[PDB]
Design a protein around this nucleic acid. Structure first.
Ligand SMILES: [Mg+2]
Ligand SMILES: [Mg+2]
Ligand SMILES: [Mg+2]
Ligand SMILES: [Mg+2]
Ligand SMILES: [Mg+2]
Ligand SMILES: [Mg+2]
Ligand SMILES: [Mg+2]
Ligand SMILES: [Mg+2]
Ligand SMILES: [Mg+2]
Ligand SMILES: [Mg+2]
Ligand SMILES: [Mg+2]
Ligand SMILES: [Mg+2]
Ligand SMILES: [Mg+2]
Ligand SMILES: [Mg+2]
Ligand SMILES: [Mg+2]
Ligand SMILES: [Mg+2]
Ligand SMILES: [Mg+2]
Ligand SMILES: [Mg+2]
Ligand SMILES: [Mg+2]
Ligand SMILES: [Mg+2]
Ligand SMILES: [Mg+2]
Ligand SMILES: [Mg+2]
Ligand SMILES: [Mg+2]
Ligand SMILES: [Mg+2]
Ligand SMILES: [Mg+2]
Ligand SMILES: [Mg+2]
Ligand SMILES: [Mg+2]
Ligand SMILES: [Mg+2]
Ligand SMILES: [Mg+2]
Ligand SMILES: [Mg+2]
Ligand SMILES: [Mg+2]
Ligand SMILES: [Mg+2]
Ligand SMILES: [Mg+2]
Ligand SMILES: [Mg+2]
Ligand SMILES: [Mg+2]
Ligand SMILES: [Mg+2]
Ligand SMILES: [Mg+2]
Ligand SMILES: [Mg+2]
Ligand SMILES: [Mg+2]
Ligand SMILES: [Mg+2]
Ligand SMILES: [Mg+2]
Ligand SMILES: [Mg+2]
Ligand SMILES: [Mg+2]
Ligand SMILES: [Mg+2]
Ligand SMILES: [Mg+2]
Ligand SMILES: [Mg+2]
Ligand SMILES: [Mg+2]
Ligand SMILES: [Mg+2]
Ligand SMILES: [Mg+2]
Ligand SMILES: [Mg+2]
Ligand SMILES: [Mg+2]
Ligand SMILES: [Mg+2]
Lengths: 52, 137, 122, 117, 204, 71
RNA sequence: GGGGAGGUUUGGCACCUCGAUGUCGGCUCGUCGCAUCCUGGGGCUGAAGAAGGUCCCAAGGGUUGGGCUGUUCGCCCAUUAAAGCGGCACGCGAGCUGGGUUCAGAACGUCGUGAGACAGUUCGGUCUCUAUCCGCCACGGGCGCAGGAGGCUUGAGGGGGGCUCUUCCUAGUACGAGAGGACCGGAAGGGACGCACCUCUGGUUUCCCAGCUGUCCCUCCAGGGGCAUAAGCUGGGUAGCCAUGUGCGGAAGGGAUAACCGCUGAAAGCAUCUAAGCGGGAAGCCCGCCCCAAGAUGAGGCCUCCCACGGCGUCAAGCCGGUAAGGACCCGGGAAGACUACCCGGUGGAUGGGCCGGGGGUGUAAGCGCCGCGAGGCGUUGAGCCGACCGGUCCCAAUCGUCCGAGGUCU
RNA sequence: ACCGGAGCGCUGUCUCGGCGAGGGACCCGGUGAAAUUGAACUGGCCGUGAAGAUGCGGCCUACCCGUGGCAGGACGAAAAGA
RNA sequence: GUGCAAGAGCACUCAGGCGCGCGGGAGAACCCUCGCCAAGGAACUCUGCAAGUUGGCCCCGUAACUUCGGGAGAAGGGGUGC
RNA sequence: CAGUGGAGGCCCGAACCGGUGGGGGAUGCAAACCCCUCGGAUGAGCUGGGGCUAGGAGUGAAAAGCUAACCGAGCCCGGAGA
């Protein structure tokens, strides 16, 4: 409301561009020694267990 | 490369062991290789130790004394080559490391505030005169 | 470190007792002044009918400082108060016997007239 | 910038302090305690000290651990069962394990502080 | 044009003949020549100097070939030295005689996104009478409608330090070849562990 | 006129946005005697310069008439 | 008495802006002009020397602290090499201040019958957390660089810096009756500033150690904890981070050149530095030193490593899985860091954590013995405790694994 | 708790800043506004134009998209100028 | 309730009731709130604005002036635990 | 003079009442708030409940202040599509 104010309604094109790097990234997983289930690296897991 | 300490310690061959012990709260006078107009001499400095800045080598220490109404303080490097002869003169109850509180009350109260560590007194006088007799015979 | 408004004690018998510095005589724009440096300074108080009176603007030279002075031989030294001696433009003390110790630095400055009178040339 | 120093911690002081004491207390009680990944890592070095300290014997070392752990019975349990089990096992009296779960709402990564065995 | 790689090991003070002197302790280990580039093969004279030893397994890179091209133990780091073709296969602290002054280039400490007052040593603003908002601010930055922009290279808060910096004319104090150490006139860029190069100064 | 410097500057007093920009404060100074006078009691800068001088003159003139009458 | 320049002042028009272009000073941050205050170079002098006057060349850098007032301005104080004048909405309030001016209250003087009024004075009086675009300072992502990849570099171009004083030697000589007092060259110390560092000096060090009051508590005595801040208070403090602390820079040297001195020399038999030509000569111009830099799409260079189509495209240009060198994800962490990026390490391991030795900080723990009616003291004791700094050791944790990624156009 | 002058004491008001504490800023997960807004593909200088240019002219410069931060301009917002 | 001269003040604590309806990390500039500092001590600045110095109690002592009550807590100093 | 006695728009200082100076807040926690500091504190004291006074009128230790969050003449309907 005060001093900081947008001068112009940002164009739909320019807006979408900003969200360029906005895209997510898929998580990383790996097959465990127990089940074939995909555990996240350096971790245990439910319905699988672990050792030591 | 795992020798970071020894490396700095190597250069530290400028060391000296001729220097006796001394902890805060005890008077001590040092001989200093002071250069006059151009020659060289030894200015003596009688005074109590206030601080000993331990830090491996280059471990400094300070001494404060009354001098014609003015209290002067001199900080000396321990392994300083210019230090001719540091001589002990009287030791007292430390009870504290850095004792600046003397600056505030330099008076007969400082005398009764800094007792006399009879423990070190004995060990000193005893080990001095006793070790003498052993070195003699 | 002595600067503009700094009060200084008087070591000599010039009759003055205390003088606030007025300006440090050195570079075009010096900031501080340790032992051995000369300064302009106003006399802020003095003994009755002394050689120099209050308000008498004077040149003087530091002789003792609260801030310790570093020695090239690693050594150091520090006094209990900041004091100085009033000087002539001939750079000689307006007074005689100057009690209270002084630094060795005064020697490398050509004020041997001071160190001679000085009892404790520490 | 000035992280040249040791570790990191949240909350003020008396809080974070009592925090370590709190986690160590319950950790010496149950042995296996799940908590945030960071908290665990810091709780790691704190507990091990109490353990190796209890590995000693003299009552001085006892009262020394009494400062953090307040329950006299819990410390009594440390000098009896806990300490001997880790005899000769100089250092590493505990273990930290990353969990795959994620606390709902805050998405905090979970982990485990297991008393090695 | 002498030159040699090394790492800042730390610093304390020694005693010259009777006066104290702060001095930094550099470590110029044996640096094997890796490639003497002549103007023929390239377009300028220089020499690649290796340094610390390395786990041969870590250097599985084609660097293995680059090391074999001169037949040398796999080093960790290697940099050139302009206009400098020495001798033998390795440079040493023997290159520098006590008394000679040297230029030491290094990587200053990283102070990150430092404030403007921290960076260019600005003045900030009043601490009492003025608003409690601009205590450490740069205040103004420009004029009015003219120019209406900002002078490029204007001093502003940002990432600072952690960059190539070169102190100069540091006199080489006592150099001990018995351990590959090298003392200097104290102040030297980089932390205790950084890679620093030492070259010949330009007094004349 | 060669031993008289005319200084100008912002006025001192009311006037609004004008008194701020539009200076119109004039101060003169007879160099050889150091003596000086100044006026600002009028919106116009020149009107002050005129008067300020007419006074500078008369004030100086009164000194000669007195110094001479002193001899 | 005459002719211009400049666009800093006052003034004259009233052309954009009254559905708003915040107005004086101060602060902060500056940049640019030269008609130059200083330093550097030079002609003339009523220039002996020194010092000075005046004019010319010259922005590279420099241009102090304080008293009075809201002041700009100005006077004064101490000093200085000098304490330059101006542009930039009289730079700068979406950066600050709000003492002034310019609302409401009050008063004096003063004008008015009055309500009221004042380039007259006086006391008081709300300064608006969120930056979309350009601009600037920093840091990433994506592609491009006609093959993929790792390591090291070239420097077109751009940036930073650039100041100066004083004492001594040559020499108390040249000059001068005397007082004074040299250029030239060399040495040394200093001020302000800038870059880097923690050895020393000295700050902080938020629980590193110790002591202390009141209170509640474990457990009655000791002993210990919580709270009294977001440390309860006090005394002291490594590492780190720091200036008051240590180190180093301005240049030297090369080249062209400014005013200016000079050589040769006409037109114009003489003469002249000039029109042909040539030499000297500024803190300034180019290079030289430090930093950035191949998005230098004009994508550079050197060293080194991998290399075949295996199935579709008749052709031109492509598509798809496995791949190689090599890269990425994940993890332990880092004087690197907002996030990201950069860097080290990942069992073939000392990366962090733990433990131990050391440095360092604190300053004689606990418990028991003894002296004293007691508060206490003494011994055991430099004990006990003990973050960051230096190093050792696989007890714990960096287990295992996965994806990407040339098969390289034409003459 | 009125306005002015001076002095003593004591101090980060200042020379001149430094370090540290915590609550926000920054990263991740959850929820999720506002004023404003002709349309935008929104560079610098010198001129230029109703006289202060991203948009006209000439010239120089500049791969595409962001994140953090500063406020010079968009005669920035706000209130149909007091 | 205990201690501080007393007190409904302050500190901790009974009985009782709460940890305030976004959290997790990181430990940049910058802002809020806060602690500390060498040497100097108002040079800051429109003004010591802000901050800090002093502080409770007991005893000694206390000027000009005065409407004789005051000025007085003037100022200045000593004592304070067990 | 001593003792007694316990007056005061007296003093110090919480509750309570009030806002001096600074800081924060400024699409706030809040259409007047928070923190530090500061005035009165047996008196023209503060406070609850019940009552009366209103628009050119009230009330006012007097500012043109207040009279239901903007009072140099309240608010709502109407003349009124002035
Ligand atoms: Mg003598
Ligand atoms: Mg670490
Ligand atoms: Mg530890
Ligand atoms: Mg408890
Ligand atoms: Mg504000
Ligand atoms: Mg502006
Ligand atoms: Mg008016
Ligand atoms: Mg008039
Ligand atoms: Mg007209
Ligand atoms: Mg308009
Ligand atoms: Mg001459
Ligand atoms: Mg001349
Ligand atoms: Mg010129
Ligand atoms: Mg004033
Ligand atoms: Mg200017
Ligand atoms: Mg202005
Ligand atoms: Mg403002
Ligand atoms: Mg005023
Ligand atoms: Mg006027
Ligand atoms: Mg006023
Ligand atoms: Mg006013
Ligand atoms: Mg752009
Ligand atoms: Mg270039
Ligand atoms: Mg470019
Ligand atoms: Mg007890
Ligand atoms: Mg306690
Ligand atoms: Mg409690
Ligand atoms: Mg300290
Ligand atoms: Mg500095
Ligand atoms: Mg030159
Ligand atoms: Mg490159
Ligand atoms: Mg004992
Ligand atoms: Mg007094
Ligand atoms: Mg764009
Ligand atoms: Mg154009
Ligand atoms: Mg974001
Ligand atoms: Mg209370
Ligand atoms: Mg201080
Ligand atoms: Mg001033
Ligand atoms: Mg106090
Ligand atoms: Mg007292
Ligand atoms: Mg009363
Ligand atoms: Mg009163
Ligand atoms: Mg009221
Ligand atoms: Mg405010
Ligand atoms: Mg107070
Ligand atoms: Mg009405
Ligand atoms: Mg009333
Ligand atoms: Mg009306
Ligand atoms: Mg109507
Ligand atoms: Mg109508
Ligand atoms: Mg009608």
């Amino acid at each position: 409301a005060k001093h900081p104010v947008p001068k112009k309604k940002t164009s739909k094109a320019r807006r979408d561009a900003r969200r360029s790097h906005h895209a997510l990234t898929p998580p990383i997983l790996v097959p465990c020694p127990e089940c074939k289930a995909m555990k996240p690296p350096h971790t245990v897991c439910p319905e699988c267990g672990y050792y030591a | 490369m795992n020798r970071g300490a020894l490396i700095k310690l190597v250069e530290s061959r400028y060391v000296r062991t001729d220097l006796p012990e001394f902890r805060p709260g005890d008077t001590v006078r040092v001989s200093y290789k002071v250069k006059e107009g151009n020659r060289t001499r030894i200015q003596d400095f009688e005074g109590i130790v206030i601080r000993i800045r331990r830090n491996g080598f280059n471990t400094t220490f300070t001494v404060r004394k009354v001098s014609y109404g003015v209290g002067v303080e001199r900080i000396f490097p321990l392994h300083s080559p210019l230090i001719q002869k540091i001589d002990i003169v009287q030791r007292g109850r430390a009870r504290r490391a850095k004792l600046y509180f003397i600056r505030n009350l330099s008076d007969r109260e400082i005398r009764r505030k800094l007792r006399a560590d009879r423990k070190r007194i004995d060990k000193d006088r005893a080990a001095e005169r006793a070790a003498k007799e052993e070195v003699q015979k | 470190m002595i600067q503009p408004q700094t009060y200084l004690e008087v070591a000599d018998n010039t009759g003055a007792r205390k003088i606030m510095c007025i300006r440090v005589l050195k570079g075009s724009n010096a900031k501080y002044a340790t032992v051995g440096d000369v300064i302009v300074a106003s006399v802020k108080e003095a003994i009755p009918r002394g050689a120099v009176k209050e308000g008498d603007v004077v040149k003087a030279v530091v002789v003792r400082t609260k801030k310790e002075v570093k020695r090239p031989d690693g050594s150091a030294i520090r006094f209990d108060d900041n004091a100085a001696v009033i000087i002539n433009n001939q750079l000689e003390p307006r007074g005689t016997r100057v009690f209270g110790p002084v630094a060795r630095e005064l020697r490398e400055k050509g004020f041997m007239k001071i160190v001679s009178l000085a009892p404790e040339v520490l | 910038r000035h992280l040249k120093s040791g570790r990191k911690l949240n909350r003020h002081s008396s809080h974070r302090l009592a925090l370590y004491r709190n986690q160590a207390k319950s950790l010496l009680t149950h042995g296996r305690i799940t908590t945030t990944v960071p908290k665990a890592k810091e709780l790691r070095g704190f507990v091990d000290h109490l353990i190796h300290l209890a590995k000693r014997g003299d009552l001085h070392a006892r009262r020394l651990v009494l400062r953090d752990l307040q329950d006299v019975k819990l410390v009594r349990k440390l000098f009896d069962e806990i300490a001997p089990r880790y005899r000769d096992r100089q250092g590493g009296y505990t273990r930290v394990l990353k969990l795959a779960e994620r606390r709902r709402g805050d998405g905090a990564p979970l982990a485990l502080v297991e008393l090695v065995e | 044009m002498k030159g040699i790689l090394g790492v800042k090991v730390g610093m304390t003070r020694i005693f010259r003949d009777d006066r104290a002197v702060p001095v930094t302790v550099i470590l110029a280990g044996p640096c094997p020549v890796v490639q003497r580039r002549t103007p023929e093969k390239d377009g300028y004279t220089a020499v690649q100097l290796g340094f610390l030893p390395q786990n041969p397994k870590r250097v599985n890179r084609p660097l293995k070939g680059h090391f074999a091209k001169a037949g040398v133990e796999p080093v960790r780091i290697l940099r050139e030295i302009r206009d400098f073709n020495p001798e033998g296969d390795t440079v040493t602290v023997e290159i520098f005689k006590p008394g000679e002054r040297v230029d030491v280039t290094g990587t200053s400490k990283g102070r990150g996104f430092a404030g403007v007052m921290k960076r260019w040593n600005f003045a900030g603003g009043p601490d009492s009478h003025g608003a409690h908002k601009i205590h450490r601010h740069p205040g103004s930055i420009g004029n009015r409608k003219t120019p209406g922009r900002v002078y490029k290279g204007k001093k502003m808060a940002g990432h600072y330090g952690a960059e190539r910096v070169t102190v100069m004319n540091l006199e080489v104090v006592d150099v001990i070849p018995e351990e590959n150490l090298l003392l200097v006139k104290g102040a030297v860029p980089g932390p205790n562990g950084g890679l620093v190069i030492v070259r010949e100064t330009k007094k004349a | 006129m060669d031993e008289i410097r005319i200084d100008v500057m912002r006025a001192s007093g009311p006037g609004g946005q004008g008194v701020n920009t539009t200076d119109s404060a004039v101060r003169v100074v007879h160099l050889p005697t150091g003596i000086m006078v100044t006026c600002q009691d009028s919106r116009s800068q020149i009107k002050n310069r005129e008067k300020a001088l007419m006074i500078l003159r008369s004030r100086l003139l009164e000194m000669k008439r007195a110094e001479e009458a002193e001899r």
